[PDB]
UniProtKB/Swiss-Prot annotation, chain A:
Annotated segments matching region Disordered: 1-17
Similarity annotation: Belongs to the CWC15 family.
Gene of this entry: CWC15
GO biological-process terms attached to the record: mRNA cis splicing, via spliceosome; mRNA splicing, via spliceosome
Record's protein name: Pre-mRNA-splicing factor CWC15
Annotated Gene Ontology cellular component terms: catalytic step 2 spliceosome; nucleus; Prp19 complex; U2-type spliceosomal complex
Subunit comment: Belongs to the CWC complex (or CEF1-associated complex), a spliceosome sub-complex reminiscent of a late-stage spliceosome composed of the U2, U5 and U6 snRNAs and at least BUD13, BRR2, CDC40, CEF1, CLF1, CUS1, CWC2, CWC15, CWC21, CWC22, CWC23, CWC24, CWC25, CWC27, ECM2, HSH155, IST3, ISY1, LEA1, MSL1, NTC20, PRP8, PRP9, PRP11, PRP19, PRP21, PRP22, PRP45, PRP46, SLU7, SMB1, SMD1, SMD2, SMD3, SMX2, SMX3, SNT309, SNU114, SPP2, SYF1, SYF2, RSE1 and YJU2.
Curated annotation (Swiss-Prot), chain B:
Functional note: Functions as a scaffold that mediates the ordered assembly of spliceosomal proteins and snRNAs. Required for association of BRR2 with the spliceosomal U5 snRNP, and the subsequent assembly of the U4/U6-U5 tri-snRNP complex. Functions as a scaffold that positions spliceosomal U2, U5 and U6 snRNAs at splice sites on pre-mRNA substrates, so that splicing can occur. Interacts with both the 5' and the 3' splice site, as well as the branch region. Has a role in branch site-3' splice site selection. Associates with the branch site-3' splice 3'-exon region. Also has a role in cell cycle.
Protein name (database record): Pre-mRNA-splicing factor 8
Residues of the full protein shown: 1074 to 1140 of 2413
Origin: domain of life: Eukaryota
Underlying gene: PRP8
Assembly description: Component of the U4/U6-U5 tri-snRNP complex composed of the U4, U6 and U5 snRNAs and at least PRP3, PRP4, PRP6, PRP8, PRP18, PRP31, PRP38, SNU13, SNU23, SNU66, SNU114, SPP381, SMB1, SMD1, SMD2, SMD3, SMX2, SMX3, LSM2, LSM3, LSM4, LSM5, LSM6, LSM7, LSM8, BRR2 and DIB1.
Compartment list: Nucleus
Domain notes: The MPN (JAB/Mov34) domain has structural similarity with deubiquitinating enzymes, but lacks the residues that would bind the catalytic metal ion.
Organism of provenance: Saccharomyces cerevisiae (strain ATCC 204508 / S288c)
Misc: Present with 468 molecules/cell in log phase SD medium.
From Swiss-Prot, chain C:
Name this protein carries in UniProt: Pre-mRNA-splicing factor CEF1
Family per record: Belongs to the CEF1 family.
Keyword Nucleus appears in the UniProt entry: yes
Source organism per UniProt: Saccharomyces cerevisiae (strain ATCC 204508 / S288c)
Residues of the full protein shown: 5 to 251 of 590
Residue intervals of the HTH myb-type domain: 1-56, 59-103
Location of the DNA-binding region in this protein: 29-52, 80-102
Subunit-structure text: Belongs to the NTC complex (or PRP19-associated complex), composed of at least CEF1, CLF1, ISY1, NTC20, SNT309, SYF1, SYF2, and PRP19.
A GO biological process held by the record: mRNA splicing, via spliceosome
Length: 69, 67, 211
């Protein structure tokens, strides 16, 4: 029905094709010239005294915490 | 409350959370979106409040039980 | 009559659902629901999850397993989904076991016929339409032939009209060779063979004419 890509449109045919002679927008001459190189109260409480996983990054969990409620 | 109610509520938070073809048993963590869940949250909040204030200061803020 | 879905799982219905699941898989619950005139998507999915899925089990628990269960109850209080998972069983069954331990047909046939019809019909409308057009086209062709043949019998020779070419560079392949990529140039001589094959071809043509 509608199918994955396997054998790409090979520019062999586009080479043997005739020229168009259209003038595209970007092929207008931009940067003509090249550059070059040189060369009491506190007692009474109950309690008185990196990973390479995008789904487990500290940034990530934090982000999720931020952006859910 | 009567233990049966408690049992029910605990069992309700433990649901399977389907979203868009992925599920999981919500083994640990209250679900806000139950109707009563608010009450549970509030009750849990009380615990936290007590921890913060202690028995004495909390008792004062509440006042005497009778009045 | 239109109405709110629910009810009880008749065995035929269950079977149908199973079939659907085999067909469409465990995450297209809408379609499967649609296949069942009575039961909802959610209902269906739940049923599959809970009762119908074969990678569950309903065998009784061993004494060790019983111990594990009741111990879990003691330790995880009535978080039965979690408990179920721990057991490796479905939850309702587990709960039931725990509790134990502590102490018309015309309609059905309609949906069946419809169901089987659907499951044995696995193509989008584009496909169906295409095959329809193909057979129609074939029919048209044969009718045309019958006319042409009829006229030949009658004595009027009519050449068959070309396909009304869609574009300027559209190809008829009988005109001339498709894209004659010739054989690799001959090391061994090929002349007699060329002749013989030519003769065979011409002979074949003659035969066809006579046929």
């Amino acid at each position: 029905s509608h199918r994955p890509q396997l054998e790409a449109r090979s520019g062999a045919k586009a080479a043997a094709y005739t020229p168009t002679g259209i003038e595209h927008a970007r092929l207008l001459p931009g940067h003509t010239t090249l550059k070059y190189r040189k060369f009491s109260w506190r007692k009474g409480t109950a309690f008185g005294r990196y990973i390479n996983d995008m789904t487990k990054s500290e940034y990530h969990q934090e982000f999720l915490h931020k952006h859910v409620r | 409350v009567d233990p049966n109610i408690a049992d029910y509520i605990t069992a309700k938070n433990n649901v399977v959370i389907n979203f868009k073809d992925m599920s999981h048993v919500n083994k640990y963590g209250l679900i806000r979106g139950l109707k009563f869940a608010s009450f549970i949250f509030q009750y849990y909040g009380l615990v936290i409040d007590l921890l913060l204030l202690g028995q004495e200061r909390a008792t004062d803020l509440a006042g005497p039980a009778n009045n | 009559p239109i109405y709110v879905k629910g009810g009880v799982w008749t065995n035929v219905e269950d079977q149908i659902l199973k079939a659907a699941v085999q067909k469409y898989g465990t995450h297209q619950w809408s379609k499967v629901a649609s296949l069942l005139q009575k039961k909802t998507a959610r209902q269906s999915e739940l049923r599959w999850n809970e009762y119908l899925n074969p990678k569950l089990n309903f065998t009784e628990f061993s004494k060790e397993e019983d111990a594990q269960l009741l111990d879990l109850a003691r330790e995880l209080p009535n978080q039965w989904r979690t408990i179920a998972d721990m057991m490796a069983r479905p939850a309702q069954v587990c709960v039931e076991r725990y509790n134990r331990l502590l102490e018309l047909e015309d309609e059905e046939k309609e949906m069946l016929a419809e169901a089987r019809a659907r499951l044995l019909n696995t193509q989008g409308k584009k496909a169906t339409r295409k095959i329809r057009e193909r057979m129609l086209e074939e029919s048209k062709r044969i009718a045309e032939l019958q006319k042409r043949r009829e006229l030949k019998q009658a004595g009027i020779n009519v050449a068959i009209k070309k396909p009304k070419k869609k574009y300027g560079t559209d190809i008829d392949y009988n005109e001339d060779i498709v894209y004659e990529q010739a054989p690799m140039p001959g090391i061994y001589d090929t002349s007699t063979e060329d002749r013989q094959i030519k003769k065979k071809f011409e002979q074949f043509e003659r035969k066809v004419n006579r046929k």
